[PDB]
């Protein structure tokens with residue numbers, strides 16, 4: 107046989123997981139008919155279990171006295187989207203979900219979209235919760251607009267309430283639809299109709315191509331029609347290669363470890379095996395057996411075979427996620443398409459109490475590994491490395507898991523704006539003469555000149571030209587950037603310059619490293635006149651939102667510390683691409699989605715300091731060291 111890589115998406119609470127566990131029982135019965143739960147083996151991760159929902163993409167694989175296959179169970183809601191995308195970035199076809207009230211959810215839309223551009227050969231809906239107020243007319247109306255998929259055929263309905271019965275039919279309509287696809291069919295349709303078998307092939311070819319697609323309906327709760335559905339889903343949906351017998355080609359699948367008893371690993375074969383050594387980036391694989399996934403639980407395997415498909419319950423270190431198993435066939439599988447899951451919003455993560463720091467450091471490593479997008483990045487202002495999560499939703503769960511394994515507890519907000527304090531206005535002071543230091547005359551002088559916006563100016567020479575004060579202007583740049591940021595208000599040198607000369611030496615006095623100390627001192631005095639330029643935070647924060655919400659979106663933007671620029675309506679939607687200060691990203695992002703329900707989207711940086719418009723109430727954070735320079739400064743102030 108073969109199988110077929112299929113995932114399961116859709117909004118929250120719409121049966122995604124249960125429907126999954128279902129396909130397991132339906133296509134099996136090797137000792138189970140429904141298996142209690144409530145909770146089971148599919149979602150074995152604590153919390154995921156004790157919690158209720160699956161915050162991590164599952165990974166199932168059922169089979170029958172005919173064939174088998176795997177699966178990937180994504181999580182609903184947001185925040186976790188970044189772990190849902192990773193699953194989708196493998197899987198060819200997506201079993202879209204849709205519960206009763208789930209009348210065209212927010213994710214029911216998107217899943218289907220990605221797949222349409224990726225190549226997903228077929229995407230399949232499954233209305234769940236046909237309990238009450240479960241029309242049939244409503245399902246199709248929603249479908250046709252959203253999924254915008256090609257007008258398929260029917261049917262799948264009959265009876266009402268307790269009298270509800272499974273049905274479908276609609277041959278003529280199907281013929282008509284298929285007609286669009288083939289000229290030959292139309293002619294026959296106009297005069298004849300042909301057969302069904304061949305028409306079934308036309309549809310099946312179109313589904314693997316990423317064009318045609320059919321949807322089956324069959325309730326869910328009472329899980330009746332469940333068992334036919336499972337048969338029918340597996341039917342048209344497998345692979346190729348296999349047939350022959352040779353070469354193993356695969357794509358190391360994710361599946362990170364845990365705390366309790368280390369972890370495992372899984373890869374998919376599409377015409378390969380499992381054993382021997384290995385290859386790829388000079389490195390030995392090391393194996394002690396082949397692989398062979400299994401329904402219930404997954405255990406080692408003696409042997410497998412070519413064109414074999416399953417999961418390997420192993421793999422650990424000396425490797426990593428997304429790993430290409432060299433080779434021959436893996437490079438081609440990389441011609442499907444990506445989705446730069448773009449993680450937009452983010453927050454500040456801070457270690458915590460001393461006791462909590464030991465665990466923190468280890469935590470930050472483990473949370474990063476169990477994530478393919480856990481960009482662990484460290485800031486300069488603090489020795490703490492902020493977390494990179496498409497949202498806190500991930501970060502809640504991330505402190506919950508940790509609270510067990512390693513054990514820790516930190517905070518989750520965003521951070522600081524460096525301050526910059528690169529105002530404009532203008533000022534100039536200098537140059538010393540000698541004192542608590544020891545002239546050491548070195549006159550000095552800095553002609554501060556605000557400027558316009560977007561030039562980072564800087565400078566400058568001065569001078570005399572004779573090595574001296576050369577590397578000295580070096581010391582310059584130094585102390586420069588130095589307070590440039592760290593300082594009174596802790597800014598980041600940006601928009602200013604300087605220049606001077608002198609003087610005295612050829613014996614002693616100490617006119618070397620001392621200059622570096624002096625430089626800062628001079629800048630400080632100019633502070634009183636500086637002000638403490640916030641800077642200018644905005645970018646363009648540019649909001650992509652629907653034509654209907656954008657008016658009210660624009661009234662809310664001025665209240666929300668944002669500016670607006672015009673917004674042209676592009677089709678059914680709009681873009682309302684504007685500027686503003688900088689964030690709060692969170693503030694910016696919340697409101698948009700809020701009065702939009704769930705049908706917002708946005709991103710974009712921009713850069714630029716020109717701003718400062720933020721008053722004060724703060725402006726601080728440093729500083730530095732270096733006896734000399736430091737001793738000198740303190741005296742100077744006196």
Ligand SMILES: Nc1nc2c(ncn2[C@@H]2O[C@H](COP(=O)(O)OP(=O)(O)CP(=O)(O)O)[C@@H](O)[C@H]2O)c(=O)[nH]1
Pocket residue numbers: 117118119120121122123124125144158159160180181182183234235236237326327328
């Ligand atoms: N009435 C009804 N309720 C159902 C049906 N299927 C599932 N549910 C309800 O939903 C609960 C859990 O749903 P689940 O499958 O985990 O939802 P989900 O799609 O995984 C949502 P997420 O993955 O985002 O956590 C069940 O315990 C049950 O009460 C159904 O067909 N009809």
